[PDB]
Subunit: 304 residues, 3 copies
């Protein structure tokens, strides 16, 4: 018996997002569907297990959940739950649209309630401190809204999806300035550094959601978002030795959301015949990196 660390939801999140990326290649390359289905089944299975473990945590370790919830830093990871729930919904849609729709709405209402209760509460002051300014804040504030946007578009609710999209995009632009200034001034401690991987996510998750809503039209906004996304990738690549100064660890799954969304967006750029060479590199790169994450995770698992 142990309380499931909430961050572990990043594993099915990354796998689910990568399933969706491969799904979007099926009409260019049919074998991509089998790869998508396998990734989707594994992500869903891991999600079920982690959901049940989290239900156990709520039942028997409620004070740990309460403390994470009220923490001005640790609360953000709870947003992984409804995010992964929506992504699993998006996977399941290929097989059962009714069950998919239920999960998508549960995740959407859940993330919106979550932010509305906790993200706003921060504006009361005195609890959040300068040192609370962490990449994890992107999860409730930004990533959850993008995930809702694309999931609702999948269901046919394009205009409602644009509202969530806007909420996420503007929230992103409003938070990042203060995050990067904080990182410049204050050296994130090693135990939090893997969460630098979340810094990769905004531009790529943003363009993926946008392309999901706008029928895959690769337009000026999409190209703009990709450009900033690759800038951040190059920066994070340069920073990687510092990120893992104290060793490789499981927290590196933090990168998987950005990586998977880079792959997903790459499929749309390829479909649209925009920067196809860059698209192929992006898609291959993201898959290799997530493959390495899977292989390091199997290892850790075969070492208890």
């Amino acid at each position: 018996p142990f309380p499931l660390p909430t961050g572990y939801f990043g594993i099915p999140l990354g796998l689910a997002a990568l399933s969706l990326a491969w799904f979007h290649l099926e009409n260019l390359f049919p074998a991509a569907r089998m790869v998508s289905d396998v990734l989707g089944i594994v992500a869903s299975a891991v999600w079920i297990l982690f959901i049940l473990m989290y239900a156990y945590k709520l039942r028997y370790y409620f004070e740990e959940v309460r403390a994470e919830y009220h923490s001005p830093v640790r609360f953000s990871f709870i947003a992984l739950i409804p995010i992964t729930t929506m992504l699993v919904g998006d996977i399941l849609y290929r097989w059962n649209p009714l069950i998919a729709e239920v999960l998508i709405w549960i995740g959407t209402i859940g993330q919106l309630l979550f932010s509305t209760l906790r993200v706003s509460e921060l504006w009361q002051g005195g609890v959040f401190e300068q040192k609370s300014t962490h990449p994890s804040f992107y999860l409730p504030a930004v990533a959850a809204n993008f995930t809702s946007a694309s999931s609702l578009a999948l269901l046919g609710y394009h205009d409602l999806g644009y509202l969530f999209f806007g909420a996420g995009m503007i929230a992103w632009i409003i938070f990042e300035p203060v995050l990067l200034q904080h990182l410049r001034i204050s050296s994130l401690e090693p135990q939090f550094r893997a969460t630098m991987g979340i810094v990769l996510a905004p531009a790529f998750v943003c363009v993926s959601a946008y392309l999901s809503i706008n029928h895959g039209e690769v337009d000026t906004l999409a190209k703009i978002l990709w450009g900033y996304g690759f800038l951040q990738l190059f920066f994070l690549l340069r920073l990687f030795p510092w990120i893992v100064e104290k060793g490789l660890n499981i927290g590196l799954w933090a990168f998987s959301f950005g990586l998977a969304s880079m792959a997903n967006s790459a499929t749309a750029f390829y479909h649209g015949n925009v920067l196809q060479g860059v698209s192929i590199f992006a898609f291959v790169f993201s898959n290799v990196m997530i493959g390495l994450l899977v292989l390091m995770t199997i290892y850790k698992l075969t070492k208890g």
Copy 2:
């Protein structure tokens, strides 16, 4: 004899903006014109009175005006004067375009001169402090430019209106990051908390101005802005008990600008057959809230 607190201009501002919202419903529902005209006449009458009271303040309480002007916090409320002057111009345009145009230009030149003198002066440093980072800054920096944008569009100056629009939109995105970080860290004191209502304004005033310039075309930008606007609404609703911790007060008119612009934008979304259900809710909600403000103000007035 007393010096008129400059913040009181928020009352005719909210009423004038709400008049304009109803005005935009007239071709869907004719009776909306009577409601618009009544609101517009009351707003204009209150504006005349407050202008005369402010002329008296300048004549006999000039040092109080000087101190408010030089304050790195209190200067912002002076921007209410040219903002309300433009909105009254926009109302009067339905009856007398020549007088309307004069007021619109006086307000536009006045707000631009005001910002150019005072907002820039802050960049000299040493006067503005971290604790000066208040929602009121939106008034000179953001709301005034949006108001110019839409007023100039009304007069047929669409391209000039886009310049003001851009100034306001980029200024908004450049200020809000630091405002929300400050609110997270430092608990705004109760006496300033009603000004949290100004946080509702940017997205809604922005989309209202945009739709005024672009002939009511509800496009991707407009939907994006509405999404962030509703996020902030939900946050402020959650925060409302904290906002009024020390009691309901007249400062709550601070919400009326955002509310009225939510109503105005809702008329355009409805006209464009986008999210009509949300539009009706938004329009009804905003009217009820401003109706409550009017009823609390009549009360206060019937209690001296």
Copy 3:
């Protein structure tokens, strides 16, 4: 023998940018080509000389270069080198596209390597301080990417140009919030104040690059960018007496990038029949100001 202060690259930068502005008037007014060619030849000659002087610095004053590189403030000026190299490439393209393309790629790879190594390294914390938050940061972070964007578009690489464009535009919006808050709180010391001129650059360099990529189409984004650009101009004009409190100096070339890009963008607005009166004013204003910079520089040179 002396080590060339890296900031001096701002002189050929401003002249090169102004050459390109005049170049864009040639099909409206043929005599503009002669003016462009003369400015372009002078900028290129000054650039060659400064490059050779900088090669000498690297060879015989390497520790001075190393210290500037590692400084969390002074590193930014090194970005002037690849920026000016690209602009000289853009000039030379009218005579020799092959040599132009080589310079453009050297400058593009060089600026991207430079940022990737140094701008990201800041996020390790503990070196950059709040007082490091200076306008010069725009050079590597923002201006270099815009310059790449427009130079690559010149070569026909529009989509790749949009990636650089996005990187610069989003980087701009993400840095400026914290810069203006810092300037409000902390009074930039006189010796750095001329660099306030760099604050003029982002919106104008941004719209110039955008118009270069999008075939000169003056659209809503372009008008938006111009509006914020003129707001900042008016602010900087008001601030000018404070900027030069301790006297006029050669650092005022800092303004030339924004001024030249105001002129360049003005040619496109004029071509597109948008705000032609404003365009003429902008173009004339920018030329007069840069003419004054040239005349003060000849003076200083005729006084050793």
